[PDB]
Nucleic acid binder design. Structure first.
Lengths: 464, 107
DNA sequence: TTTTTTTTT
């Protein structure tokens, strides 16, 4: 196979087979002939009809991926012969990125990066979409050579073509969200530090020049900024956010309005690779409760077994709370519930800092919860994992309860009042919606702690 | 064809399954590696014994299509195998529901 | 050379 890595066990890939067929059609007209003669031949052939047009575009595309010494010539021919502004090519790129990226041969990956950059420079329609789909293949919690290569490669395109990036509000927010998150992972070697600095400068310039566009991210932007707050460039940014927000934008009152704005789902989703999503969605829709062990083991083995992978866990947790909102039929079935997934992910934490970050991600929509603007499905997992862990693993219930109390003055002290109000609104609304009918039997349960059972029977009087 | 339909002596078995477990490798007296993999359908589970290199490629979670399989009893255990002219081909991973029970390979 | 109604105790 020319596009994909395959073992002898792997079935033949239908998409790879189709692209190879197309390349061989183009090749039948371009080999052994001059470049002018070749273009005359392709022009003629394309005119015969729309499927021939597809064959030729997909052919040239595949040659660009598989023949780097013919790539510049073939992109030139592609641009010339394409009748749909390279749209068929863009769909196929997105298809390759969403479905085949992990199997894509090194040469083909290198070439694809080259192609996208060439697409940006040409001002092709939809290129910004392609860049976002590309960014989604950069996995969080992964500092392998190939993943780091992709992070830097895409960043280089974005920075070199920053003027073009500024035309796309969504691409600005997405690039900032993506790189603010990856920065956390980029330390430990000289190579990682050098890349982090480039990512810092890039995010900082977009935040300062286009703050308002970055705000469409919503409150999770704050979580990401806190996680990089000790980096000098970001300390400066914070004092501007906290003390004179107006420099950032006249339309930016302060951090509160940002905390009171929900996070858009596309941002939470972009920090899971296609394979991560496919697996979690399958777990939360098709896996029967009681049958989840091997699925969990398989997921854990692939994504959560390295020390570097720890940061990936908050992304999964925000994704479960904010993106996976199961139908009524799933909720009323024996399907693996979101709270069980959450409980599983919490036990895979291998340090107290990871645990704390995980808990913050779980409760993140509790902090400033307004019942008319926020979805109750975002706050449901936390309360349900607390409730259902009472008997079996009372350790989990206890610690989350402790965190729920202590996060109020600690999350962001000048807004303790608001956070307190948020946690209260969350709790109230959880009762009003019958997610949990009674809050009392969670605070007096005999299987709890001496100190905590007391700490509970205090912090909220309304639950005795 | 489903796992539950597999019977001693049947051949030309074509089916799909997801692997749950890969066992330890043993060596035949003439130098072949053999390993037993537990695989499953929504109708239950069965062992497949896989000779040689493909045996090292198979991973738990793999969704595999078997063509021209045959079945036979080895050490009291109904077992599935790849026939002459047949093969194992991975067509996906993870996303398949299955039942562990019955285990058609129990003695 | 594609093993294969295969597998030393």
């Amino acid at each position: 196979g020319r596009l994909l890595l395959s073992t002898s066990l792997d079935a033949k890939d239908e998409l790879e087979e189709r692209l190879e067929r197309c390349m061989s059609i183009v090749t039948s007209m371009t080999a052994g002939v001059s470049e002018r003669e070749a273009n005359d031949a392709l022009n003629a052939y394309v005119c015969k009809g729309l499927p021939q047009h597809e064959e030729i575009c997909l052919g040239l595309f595949t040659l660009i991926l598989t023949e780097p010494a013919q790539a510049q010539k073939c992109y030139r021919d592609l641009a010339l012969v394409s009748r749909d502004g390279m749209n068929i090519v863009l769909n196929k790129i997105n298809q390759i990125l969403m479905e085949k990226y992990l199997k894509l041969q090194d040469t083909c990956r290198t070439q694809l990066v080259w192609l996208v950059r060439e697409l940006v420079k040409s001002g092709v329609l939809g290129a910004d979409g392609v860049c976002m789909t590309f960014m989604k293949q950069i996995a969080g919690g992964d500092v392998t050579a190939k993943n780091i290569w992709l992070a830097e490669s895409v960043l280089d395109i974005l920075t070199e073509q920053r003027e073009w990036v500024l035309k796309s509000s969504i691409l600005i927010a997405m690039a900032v969200y993506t790189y603010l998150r990856l920065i956390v992972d980029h330390h430990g070697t000289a190579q990682l530090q050098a890349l982090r600095q480039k990512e810092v400068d890039f995010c900082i310039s977009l935040l300062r020049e286009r703050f308002m566009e970055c705000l469409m991210i919503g409150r999770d932007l704050v979580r990401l900024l806190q996680n990089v707050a000790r980096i000098p460039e970001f300390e400066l940014l914070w004092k501007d956010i906290i003390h004179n927000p107006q420099a950032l934008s006249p339309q930016f009152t302060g951090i509160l309005q940002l905390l009171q704005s929900r996070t858009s789902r596309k941002f939470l989703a972009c920090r899971l690779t296609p394979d991560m999503e496919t697996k979690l969605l399958f777990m939360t829709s098709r896996v029967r409760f009681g049958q989840q062990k091997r699925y969990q083991d398989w997921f854990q083995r692939q994504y959560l077994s390295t020390p570097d992978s720890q940061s990936l866990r908050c992304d999964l947790i925000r994704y479960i709370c904010g993106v996976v909102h199961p139908s009524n039929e799933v909720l009323s079935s024996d399907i693996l519930p979101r709270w069980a997934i959450i409980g599983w992910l919490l036990t895979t934490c291998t340090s107290n800092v990871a645990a704390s970050n995980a808990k913050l991600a779980l409760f993140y929509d509790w902090l400033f919860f307004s019942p008319d603007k926020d979805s109750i499905m975002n706050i449901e997992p936390a309360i349900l994992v607390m409730h259902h862990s009472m008997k079996p693993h009372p350790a989990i219930t206890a610690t989350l309860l402790d965190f729920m109390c202590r996060i109020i003055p600690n999350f962001y002290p000048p807004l303790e009042g608001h956070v307190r109000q948020g946690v209260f609104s969350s709790l109230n609304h959880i009762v009003e919606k019958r997610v949990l009918a009674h809050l009392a039997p969670l605070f007096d349960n005999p299987k709890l702690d001496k100190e905590l059972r007391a700490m509970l029977r205090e912090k909220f009087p309304e639950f005795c | 064809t489903f796992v539950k339909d597999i019977k001693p002596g049947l051949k030309n078995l074509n089916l799909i399954f997801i692997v749950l477990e890969t066992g330890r490798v043993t060596k035949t007296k003439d130098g072949h590696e053999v390993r037993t993999c537990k695989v499953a359908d929504k109708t239950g589970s069965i062992n497949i014994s896989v000779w040689d290199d493909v045996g090292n490629l198979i991973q738990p979670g793999d969704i595999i299509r078997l063509t021209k399989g045959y079945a036979s009893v080895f050490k009291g255990c109904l077992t599935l195998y790849t026939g002459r002219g047949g093969d194992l081909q991975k067509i996906g991973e993870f996303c398949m529901v299955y039942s562990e029970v019955p285990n058609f390979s129990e003695p």
